[model samples]
Target: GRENLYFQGGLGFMALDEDLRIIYVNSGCLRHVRRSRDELLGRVVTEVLPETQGSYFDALCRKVLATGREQQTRVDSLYSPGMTIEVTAAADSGALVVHFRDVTAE
Candidate 1:
């Protein structure tokens, strides 16, 4: 489970069950959403991160589940006011690992 740490660094990590309920998250991710880990766990992924729905994130999840293959992509995002980031998502079995980097320097 700790291997999921690869997605750390300003990134948000989320795992969904078959019902699409969030089962896991990382500290970095919780900070981005301005929520604590306890507040997000066991909730619907879309309910916790509404911004993710209808965006590239939703598409990625659908593709991963349908294809059963690993998927990766980079997206420019505003995790919060004054915080812009480049996020990469890697989809695996029943889990979506997201890695984000602050690209403001670039």
Candidate 2:
């Protein structure tokens, strides 16, 4: 069921360390960000998606890491500027789990 959700439902999943360096990503996330693992792993979130700096995605990541709470927001795609995407950040095992979905249709 979880596999179906992250892989088939079109929701992207990524995990980052406290410093925001990407540690894990699934195929869905690669699709959403238009990046391959070679271009993403060990890279800071802002490095991979510069437009996310100081944006909702950046702020929420810091907030979740600091407070260990989940946060959510919707914003324009950092990968494709015109598209809309919804993102959620949650703290897990000292890392951040980020899930996002294309919400342009909504």
Candidate 3:
């Protein structure tokens, strides 16, 4: 079912509003991120991972906003602990969907 697929890929799921506020996240994301779901909801992503402020995570979302297609990119050593992850950003109706997986070692 949906639950199975949600965890099957081991990819983190995150949905952001036009304002960059977190609207949705899954357990995969919970594991990768330092904070729990409660801390992420309605909060800006850059705030959750300060390293993302001027990084590609922010750019990919902006690209999704403009390009209207799934955009893929990889970052080497990100976040506090500096884990590497691959990211994809796509527009889903009015929201932006971002998926991340640890690629340093994914």
Best by TM-score: 2
lDDT of 3 by residue, 1-106 (tens): 1222235466678888988889998887777666788988999877777777777776787788888878887776465346776677777778888786676665
Task: State the lDDT of candidate 1 residue by residue for 42-69, as single tens digits.
Answer: 9988887888889877887787678776
The lDDT of model 2 is: 0.79
Candidate 2: regions farther than 4 A off: 1-8
Backbone N/Cα/C clashes per model: 0, 0, 0
If scored against the real structure, what TM-score would every candidate get? 0.72, 0.80, 0.78
- Which of 1 and 2 is ahead in lDDT? 2
lDDT of each: 0.67, 0.79, 0.74
Worst 10 residues of 2 by lDDT: 1-10
Please give the distance, in angstroms, between residue 58's alpha carbon in candidate 1 and its true position after superposition. 0.8
Tens digits of per-residue lDDT, candidate 2, 24-96, equal: 9888788877778989999987887798888777788878877888888888877778889877887768778
What lDDT, from 0 to 1, does candidate 3 have?
0.74
